[PDB]
Design a protein around this ligand. Structure first.
Ligand SMILES: [Zn+2]
Length: 71
């Protein structure tokens, strides 16, 4: 958090000691669109959200920290 930044961008790294676009909730914002279909992959209907019980637990199928090309 504000280590050696000042140039312009100050979100290149989320407060999670890592890239912002490399986080979940970060990608949950809907910054992806490989297939511009409002989605990419999934197989788990909406429900018990991320502790938000908002009703939407989109299964991160074919889209993880490795399952993004393999299986
Ligand atoms: Zn983040």
């Amino acid at each position: 958090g504000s280590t050696a930044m000042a140039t312009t961008m100050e979100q290149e790294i989320c407060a999670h000691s890592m890239t912002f676009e490399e986080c979940p909730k970060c990608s949950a914002l809907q910054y992806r669109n490989g297939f511009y279909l409002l989605k990419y992959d999934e197989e788990w209907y909406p429900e018990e959200l991320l502790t938000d019980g908002e009703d939407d637990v989109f299964d991160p199928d074919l889209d993880m920290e490795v399952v993004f090309e393999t299986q």
